[PDB]
Amino acid sequence: FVNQHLCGSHLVEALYLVCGERGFFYTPKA
Amino acid sequence: GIVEQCCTSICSLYQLENYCN
């Protein structure tokens, strides 16, 4: 599911699935 | 940043994991 164009909620969803209990940071401007 | 790498272009597990805590 990670090998494609992922934008907005699609990207955040992938980060969530991939990072698990580590969590993540989402920085669309940085 | 992540938008350029995963939205404007094709994402990868490698890059996504760069953003895990």
PDB file of C-alpha atoms in Angstrom:
ATOM      1  CA  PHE A   1       0.000   0.000   0.000  1.00  0.00           C
ATOM      2  CA  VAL A   2       3.041   2.261   0.365  1.00  0.00           C
ATOM      3  CA  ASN A   3       4.363   2.169  -3.191  1.00  0.00           C
ATOM      4  CA  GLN A   4       2.150   4.802  -4.815  1.00  0.00           C
ATOM      5  CA  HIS A   5       1.229   8.483  -4.763  1.00  0.00           C
ATOM      6  CA  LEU A   6      -0.053   9.225  -1.270  1.00  0.00           C
ATOM      7  CA  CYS A   7      -1.533  12.639  -0.540  1.00  0.00           C
ATOM      8  CA  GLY A   8      -3.446  14.113   2.375  1.00  0.00           C
ATOM      9  CA  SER A   9      -5.374  11.571   4.422  1.00  0.00           C
ATOM     10  CA  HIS A  10      -3.940   8.783   2.259  1.00  0.00           C
ATOM     11  CA  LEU A  11      -0.411   9.749   3.342  1.00  0.00           C
ATOM     12  CA  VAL A  12      -1.321  10.123   6.989  1.00  0.00           C
ATOM     13  CA  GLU A  13      -3.048   6.735   6.897  1.00  0.00           C
ATOM     14  CA  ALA A  14       0.094   5.103   5.471  1.00  0.00           C
ATOM     15  CA  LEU A  15       2.282   6.739   8.122  1.00  0.00           C
ATOM     16  CA  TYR A  16      -0.089   5.456  10.793  1.00  0.00           C
ATOM     17  CA  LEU A  17      -0.029   1.895   9.453  1.00  0.00           C
ATOM     18  CA  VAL A  18       3.722   1.820   8.917  1.00  0.00           C
ATOM     19  CA  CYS A  19       4.821   3.465  12.165  1.00  0.00           C
ATOM     20  CA  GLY A  20       2.556   1.590  14.572  1.00  0.00           C
ATOM     21  CA  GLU A  21       3.099   2.348  18.258  1.00  0.00           C
ATOM     22  CA  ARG A  22       6.174   4.439  17.440  1.00  0.00           C
ATOM     23  CA  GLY A  23       3.863   7.096  16.052  1.00  0.00           C
ATOM     24  CA  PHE A  24       5.062   9.637  13.519  1.00  0.00           C
ATOM     25  CA  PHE A  25       5.318  13.276  12.540  1.00  0.00           C
ATOM     26  CA  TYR A  26       3.500  14.718   9.550  1.00  0.00           C
ATOM     27  CA  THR A  27       4.973  17.961   8.272  1.00  0.00           C
ATOM     28  CA  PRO A  28       3.478  18.956   4.885  1.00  0.00           C
ATOM     29  CA  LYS A  29       5.186  22.368   4.830  1.00  0.00           C
ATOM     30  CA  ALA A  30       8.600  21.392   6.217  1.00  0.00           C
TER      31      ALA A  30
ATOM     32  CA  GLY B   1       9.668  17.207   2.431  1.00  0.00           C
ATOM     33  CA  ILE B   2       7.275  14.281   2.703  1.00  0.00           C
ATOM     34  CA  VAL B   3       4.760  15.805   0.301  1.00  0.00           C
ATOM     35  CA  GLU B   4       7.379  16.134  -2.441  1.00  0.00           C
ATOM     36  CA  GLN B   5       8.603  12.590  -1.806  1.00  0.00           C
ATOM     37  CA  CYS B   6       5.322  10.719  -1.329  1.00  0.00           C
ATOM     38  CA  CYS B   7       2.545  12.867  -2.801  1.00  0.00           C
ATOM     39  CA  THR B   8       4.062  14.625  -5.818  1.00  0.00           C
ATOM     40  CA  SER B   9       6.152  11.511  -6.440  1.00  0.00           C
ATOM     41  CA  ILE B  10       5.772   7.819  -5.611  1.00  0.00           C
ATOM     42  CA  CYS B  11       6.202   7.005  -1.923  1.00  0.00           C
ATOM     43  CA  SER B  12       8.261   4.177  -0.459  1.00  0.00           C
ATOM     44  CA  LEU B  13       8.410   2.267   2.809  1.00  0.00           C
ATOM     45  CA  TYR B  14      11.959   3.519   3.226  1.00  0.00           C
ATOM     46  CA  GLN B  15      10.877   7.150   3.143  1.00  0.00           C
ATOM     47  CA  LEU B  16       7.758   6.702   5.262  1.00  0.00           C
ATOM     48  CA  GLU B  17       9.822   5.167   8.050  1.00  0.00           C
ATOM     49  CA  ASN B  18      12.010   8.291   8.064  1.00  0.00           C
ATOM     50  CA  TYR B  19       8.978   9.947   9.649  1.00  0.00           C
ATOM     51  CA  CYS B  20       8.287   7.455  12.439  1.00  0.00           C
ATOM     52  CA  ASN B  21       9.242   8.516  15.963  1.00  0.00           C
TER      53      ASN B  21
END
